[PDB]
Ligand binder design. Structure first.
Ligand SMILES: CS(=O)(=O)c1ccc(N2CCNCC2)cc1
Ligand SMILES: CS(=O)(=O)c1ccc(N2CCNCC2)cc1
Lengths: 304, 304
């Protein structure tokens, strides 16, 4: 028993991290097969970031200007290309530690682990969620660009995020591994304000199910609600609307606990309206939304 | 910027996890050099756990009764011995993935990462603290025994914990890698109640410093206090007493932020007396105590 914010074991991704330097900029790259992926802003100086023309800046770069180092050994760059906001550096050596992998573009509400790196060296691993406004609340200092987000299914790593930017509000923006930003963000140092950071309702309900499974049951009430009634309260509290797809996804947690999804919605509704009253749920004084229903099932069953 | 509960990259420890089976029990082992370390309760049936005599149970076991599997390959056991509450299984093959390592016994308040494993397979990584009552609040299902806690200093892994027990209250107990339990706990299925789970004051202060560095400054007040005055309030709120050693340890955070340690103590004192008033600090509605001052410095500087 016990319920923790857990990240995937990072070993498979650690074997892919490399350091990429272009001029005076050093950031992280992801080495899979004979390609190194990194943010295209590696070619920008701090000055260029204010209004960069990436195609024009890239013309002044040749293969030998991209310095790729894996551990303390240099990789030979034999090609380079820009795909959206990522650069793909073809190297002459396939990464011997390349795991089975996929590139996936996640939806808001989905969680993933981030391996924060500096100079191609992993420093830490944490668990995140793609917010409904397409930002992530990460922990990234200068030099962390190119650090990646991923999920693991047994032995296959699905890479879903690459770190690019920090908005003026301290929240983070990045791309999938095809170089397309999540949300409306651009790799330019300009006014980019995030939209409403709503709460991921289906994730909160999943976490309330985890709480019940782990013994924290004080919040369970004698009420029920409907999807429409619940959603009126959810809109008022800046919670994402709950759909029948979400109810279907919570089905196994409902079955395991014997608590109908709409009953849990009514408990959540009273928690929103009454507050926690100084109490905690799974050691938290607020409603946690960075566990998906899949995460709750995985952690509560022990998927390796 | 941004501040996350971060675990160390788990790769170096993943390469050490093996599956140990003795009779009908399968749990995790840690393979370092030619020794596999695992909880000695691997020799117990669920019935034996009620009142086990480990020396007597171990007499009925031979080297060939301990089945050690690393990946899908079997290791040959050429010796076995009991050291406190851990079994050391000598194998004929040194782990080729053995990192540089130390065995350390941590003090309460110290944090570490746990690589939760099942059947010798890593399922997740999370960050923990040794509580002042010598329990840990982990996430461990049946089959997780033998999962380990560690800290990494560049390339050296300091193993500090091995999971053994879950108390009837759902909190966890375990040993250092010499087999000595943290706290008064024993590897027997009997009434073992934990003492007071007090808050790790020096860790809360470190985290308030992290909050200031990351822009969350609402809680800073116009007051100061003394160690003795602060400690009177800390005792009342079940917080650990703050010592001059703790003040010394917070010195670099005080220097970086320009906020004297005793001033931060006065802010913490008002947070204890007034509460959060529905506000959050670093996305938390309660005062976080599972970041040491060292962790705050490491995360805020980018140590890899
Ligand atoms: C606006 S920001 O803080 O997200 C940001 C600003 C600058 C950069 N650099 C790219 C690498 N070359 C140096 C400049 C990257 C991100
Ligand atoms: C009291 S408890 O839940 O912490 C616990 C109970 C039993 C066990 N087993 C050891 C391995 N063999 C089967 C029994 C381990 C821990």
């Amino acid at each position: 028993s016990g319920f923790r914010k857990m990240a995937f074991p990072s070993g498979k991704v650690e074997g892919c991290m490399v350091q990429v330097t272009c001029g005076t900029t050093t950031l992280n790259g992801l080495w899979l097969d004979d390609v190194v992926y990194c943010p295209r802003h590696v070619i920008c100086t701090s000055e260029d970031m204010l209004n960069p023309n990436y195609e024009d800046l890239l013309i002044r770069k040749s293969n030998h200007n991209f310095l790729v180092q894996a551990g303390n050994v240099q990789l030979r760059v034999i090609g380079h290309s820009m795909q959206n906001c990522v650069l793909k550096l073809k190297v002459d050596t396939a990464n011997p530690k390349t795991p089975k992998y996929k590139f996936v573009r996640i939806q808001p509400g989905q969680t993933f682990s981030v391996l924060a790196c500096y100079n191609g060296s992993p420093s830490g691993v944490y668990q995140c969620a793609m917010r409904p406004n397409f930002t992530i609340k990460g922990s990234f200092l200068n030099g962390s660009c190119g650090s990646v987000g991923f999920n693991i299914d047994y032995d296959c790593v699905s890479f879903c995020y690459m770190h690019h930017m920090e908005l003026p509000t301290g929240v983070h923006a990045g791309t999938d591994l095809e170089g397309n930003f999540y949300g409306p963000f651009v790799d330019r140092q300009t006014a980019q304000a995030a939209g409403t950071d709503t709460t991921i309702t289906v994730n909160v309900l999943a976490w309330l199910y985890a709480a019940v499974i782990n013994g924290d049951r004080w919040f369970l009430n004698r009420f029920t609600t409907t999807l429409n009634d619940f959603n009126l309260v959810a809109m008022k509290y800046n919670y994402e609307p709950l759909t029948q797809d979400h109810v279907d996804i919570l089905g196994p947690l409902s079955a395991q606990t014997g608590i109908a999804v709409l009953d849990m919605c009514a408990s959540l509704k009273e928690l929103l309206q009454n507050g926690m009253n100084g109490r905690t749920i799974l050691g938290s004084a607020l409603l946690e939304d960075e566990f998906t229903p899949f995460d709750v099932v995985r952690q509560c069953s022990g998927v390796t």
